[PDB]
Amino acid sequence: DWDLVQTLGEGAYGEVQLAVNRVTEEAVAVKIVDMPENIKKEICILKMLNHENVIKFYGHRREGNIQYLFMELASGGSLFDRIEPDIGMPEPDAQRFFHQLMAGVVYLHGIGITHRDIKPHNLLLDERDNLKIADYSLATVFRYNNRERLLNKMCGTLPYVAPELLKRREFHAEPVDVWSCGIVLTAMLAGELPWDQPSDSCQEYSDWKEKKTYLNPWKKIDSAPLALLHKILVENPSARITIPDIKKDRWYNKPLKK
Ligand SMILES: CC(C)(O)[C@]12CN(c3cc(-n4ncc5ccc(-c6ccn[nH]6)cc54)ncn3)[C@H](C1)C2
């Protein structure tokens, strides 16, 4: 019924392909997984999703040991491909994408789900350039029956992970996703990642902690979004800005055009 045309992206288990229906020509995204605990959890999370800034899940089909996960194709491609290396993108476009990213993350956190791997390759765009949070292979429950569960597993992508994930045995989920959103905002406004990892052995991270904002990528960023990044990229997660307070930030609320 479907023909595999091109690879769309990668992940820790299986692969995501562009599939074209042999009868209707309908183009969709399909995740093909070989061989059980991890896929059952992923399917469960994908079934919970219903929001404008999260990738739409059509359903799943099992054939022997092979699992197929059907998702709405993001015709605008990835946010990664909108970032010009060493430049970024126009500040109004970055602000709009950031507003949409916050909308999707508030939605996930509201249903007690943490994404755990927010980065430009996992942020896709529809026909009208609406951002959509994709890939739930690392996603997990951090709140159930109004009771929070601490995370105790290391995962994600090193330039995007919060420092507490490397240091603490257990840590709160929401500040970790807030942090990765801050690295995404830095990438959008500067076209470069600030550090390989948020550790003391990383000079670029030490330089940020020492407020050396006269260095790249910070010197490419205007004072208003930089003031927001100073509130997000806070080492101590208990002192880090929360999403309700990000929504009150001067740059977040600044009228911008084109
Ligand atoms: C230019 C071109 C060749 O015509 C494009 C590029 N496009 C896309 C779409 C997607 N999609 N769409 C849905 C979807 C769900 C999950 C994932 C994913 C990424 C990582 N893990 N899961 C990726 C997904 N990814 C990348 N590029 C559309 C084809 C436009």
Q: Name 20's bridge partners.
A: 3, 27
Alpha-carbon distance of 258 to 92, in angstroms, equals 6
Question: Which residues 6+ apart lie within 8 Å of 46 measured at CB?
Answer: 57, 60, 69, 136
Amino acid type, 255: P
3-state secondary structure of 211: coil
User: Per DSSP, what are the bridge partners of residue 19?
Assistant: 4, 28
Kindly provide the resolution of this structure in angstroms, with one decimal. 1.5
Euclidean distance between the first and the last CA atom of the chain, given in angstroms as a whole number: 43
What is the spatial order of strands in the sheet that 77-78 belongs to? 77-78, 123-125, 131-133
Partners of residue 132 on adjacent β-strands = 124
The C-alpha atoms of residue 221 and residue 79 are separated, in whole angstroms, by 19
Distance of CA 136 to the CA centre of its chain: 10
The β-bridge relationship of strands 147-148 and 66-71 is unpaired
Query: Which tokens hold the place of 50?
Result: 């219903």
- Sort strands 113-114 and 140-141 into parallel, antiparallel or unpaired: antiparallel
User: Under a CB-based contact definition with an 8 Å cutoff, are residues 252 and 224 in contact?
Assistant: no
Cα of 130 vs centre of ligand 1, distance in Å, is 14
For ligand 1, atom 2: residue with the closest CA: 77
DSSP 195: -
Which structure tokens are listed for 79?
Answer: 């946010």
Ligand 1, atom 27, lies closest to the CA of: 77
Q: How many CA atoms lie within 13 A of 71 on its CB side?
A: 30
Which residue from 13, 45, 56 is spatially nearest to 31, judged by alpha carbons?
13
What φ, ψ does residue 97 adopt, rounded to 5°?
-60, -40
Task: Given the residues 117, 126, 200, 245, select the one marked as catalytic.
Answer: 117
Contact of 185 with 94, CB cutoff 8 Å: yes
Identity (one letter) of the amino acid at 199? S
166 lines ligand 1 (CB under 6 A): no
List binding-site positions for ATP: 8-16, 31
Helix H segments across 83-235?
91-110, 163-167, 173-190, 203-209, 223-232
Quick one: which atom of ligand 1 is closest to the CA of 76?
30
CB of 71 within 6 A of ligand 1: the answer is yes
Question: Using alpha carbons only, how large is the chain's radius of gyration in Å?
Answer: 19
Annotated binding residues, as ranges? 8-16, 31
Question: Residue 33 forms beta bridges with which residues?
Answer: 67
Phi, psi for 17 (deg, rounded to 5): -115, 155
Sorted by sequence, the CB contacts under 8 Å of residue 197 that are 6+ apart come out as: 158, 159, 161, 166, 205
Q: Which residues contact 87 (CB under 8 A, 6 or more apart)?
A: 190, 191
Active site residue 177: no
Q: Is the link from the previous residue into 198 a cis peptide, with omega within 30 of 0?
A: no
Report the distance separating Cα 152 and Cα 85, nearest Å: 34
